[PDB]
Design a binder for this molecule. Structure first.
Ligand SMILES: Nc1nc2c(ncn2[C@@H]2O[C@H](COP(=O)(O)OP(=O)(O)NP(=O)(O)O)[C@@H](O)[C@H]2O)c(=O)[nH]1
Ligand SMILES: [Mg+2]
Length: 169
């Protein structure tokens, strides 16, 4: 049913929009409701790149600290990570460094990572500049993206770039 299968994990503080990000990408759907993820969830999505069928096993992790042990247990085997924060939430941005270290502690075999500042549609409520996001991504050695699960801005682009760097690894 596939030529390659890439395991991808979406991590970051609770409420940054990780589930919404996946919901938009996999089902082209979005819900304004906040239904916190219990531990970890996943969605499989088959994409077609260079005439090849790549199965994307996407794990949607819970952001709350109490689920750290449950979620980090899935880091090994992950080939790509979407480290997400909310442009309207400073605390979620300040947590990026620690999320980055978490990836280093539990990930294996040079997993690829993209830093994503979600909810970019909330321009009037923005608290973290794109400049700061880009600057942190650079220092962490990650490529940067700002996106919107709500307005469907850069969700596909984010996932496709991740698939590219994983494939070209
Ligand atoms: N305006 C806007 N709201 C968004 C966006 N993405 C997600 N949200 C909203 O932010 C809230 C939390 O989103 P959710 O996807 O549940 O976040 P999460 O990071 O998965 N949470 P947890 O880690 O607690 O499971 C929801 O109310 C959702 O509608 C976005 O791009 N724009
Ligand atoms: Mg969630």
């Amino acid at each position: 049913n596939f030529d390659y299968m890439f395991k991808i994990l979406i991590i970051g503080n609770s409420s940054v929009g990780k589930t919404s990000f996946l919901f938009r990408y996999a089902d082209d759907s979005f819900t304004p409701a906040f239904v916190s993820t219990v531990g970890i969830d996943f969605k499989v999505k088959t994409i077609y790149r260079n005439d090849k069928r790549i199965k994307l096993q996407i794990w949607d992790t819970a952001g709350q600290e109490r689920y750290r042990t449950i979620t980090t247990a899935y880091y090994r085997g992950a080939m790509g990570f979407i480290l997400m924060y909310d442009i309207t939430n400073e605390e979620s941005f300040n947590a990026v460094q620690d999320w980055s270290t978490q990836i280093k502690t539990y990930s294996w075999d040079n997993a690829q990572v993209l830093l994503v500042g979600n909810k970019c549609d909330m321009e009037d409520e923005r608290v973290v500049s794109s400049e700061r996001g880009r600057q942190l991504a650079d220092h962490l050695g990650f490529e940067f993206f700002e996106a919107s699960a709500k307005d469907n801005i850069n969700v596909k682009q984010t996932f496709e770039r991740l698939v590219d760097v994983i494939c070209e690894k």
